Amino acid sequence: VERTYLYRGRILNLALEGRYEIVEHKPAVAVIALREGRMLFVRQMRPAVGLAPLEIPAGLIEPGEDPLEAARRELAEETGLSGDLTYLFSYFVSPGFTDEKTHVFLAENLKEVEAHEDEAIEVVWMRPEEALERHQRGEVEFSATGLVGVLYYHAFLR
Template identity: 50%
Template sequence: MREVKFRGRLITVATLDGHWEVVEHPDAVAVLVARGRELLGVRQARPAVGAATWEIPAGLIEPGESPAEAAAREAAEEVHLAGELVPVTRLYASPGFTDELCHLFELTRTRQARADADPGEHLVPEWRDALEVWTAVANGSETTSGVTLLAVRHLLARCGTFV
């Protein structure tokens, strides 16, 4: 049996069978944009963790939107690019407590595009070397999202760099 304990603008918290607490959250997308061994990300304030983080473009799938449509929108809003979207994989954000599924795409054959960022988002696009990002996360000098780290690992493997 499912019982809703809290319903907010972004999340719903429910209990299942009176025991399991589950955060119901909209699914998301993330977009890998690569140039050789570099990938394009954005640095932005993340109030939930009290820090600015560098991540690949990402965002929620809006109602009625397909994952590919959401990925195209996020790429245009966050890094001003459009192109061909190639599905890479999907992953759960944190399956121990939330149902959020993130769809990772790679954007290829890129061209300039322009869309307005979400209100309140102040994004700074930045190209980074994938191995440098991996090393910074591994040695603890930087923290990023799980889907960004997966994209970094995917790019490194494709470039023949195994870590």
Template identity: 50%
Template sequence: MRVSGPGLHGKCSTLAVMSDTPGSTAVLYDGHIVKLELQDGKWEIVRHRDAVSVLVLDGEGRMLCVRQPRRAIGTDTVEAPAGLIDDGETPEQAARRELQEEAGLDGDMRLLTRYYSSPGFSDEQIYLYHATNLRESRLPMDDDEQIEVEWLQPRAVLEGLRDGTMTGSATTVTAALYALQVQA
């Protein structure tokens, strides 16, 4: 039995009655950004679009961060520029686009690492890039984005991570990699 109705962004979602047959996968929800599956009748798996995050440092060693409201947690966050990879884009193209949209910058991109944001239940990978040789290059922001650019000293970013005022896995990994590079 299936029940359909409006999903995220007007897309159709599908709810399915679960099966506990070994090897079975039931799609519980299929939206614009995520798909929720039930495997073997007991494992909830979130299929999520992959994302990118970009580490940017200016000539004074400050880290580019963006402040923006995040509905899922009900507050503003300060984080590294980041976003989802669109259909047909490579991770590098997405990193370049996000940096242009959120900060009006472009540069040479180098992949630092990629990691799973929450591998216990989601397949989302985040590709972390370092942008250098920066130049102005602006793309329009998405209609739903309200972003303020902030240049922060790395020490302030690390303190924000320690005291909980800065959150988000991409920002945490970005700052940690930066700190490791400085100490290496």
């Protein structure tokens, strides 16, 4: 059960636990938002993958914040919107090697609170049906958060 640390970083630590390679990572949040049949996706260059996958607004929980507060913050910083947020569920992104846990919220009754992360983040309103069709046609890649948003919409928001 003990860990020995190979790297202590900015957004992760690398440890060994016995024979296991473990990446400790801050928890994250993600926000599903629908308006007039379009879901609020975002894209940004992601150096780990060398491309900009289709995501939903997401970010890390910072010191002092709970998940709800982090979700409100990254919705505003990434898209300039506020909404009424409801906790949906959480998931471990890849529990075979990392402890990153993502907390997912629904946002309703959106309002623009900032006109304008604008240089870094592209806001992509798109019907989820179209996002899934583009992905099936090889036109865009998903992050887990983007795919979860699309599936949740099809399951519960039509």
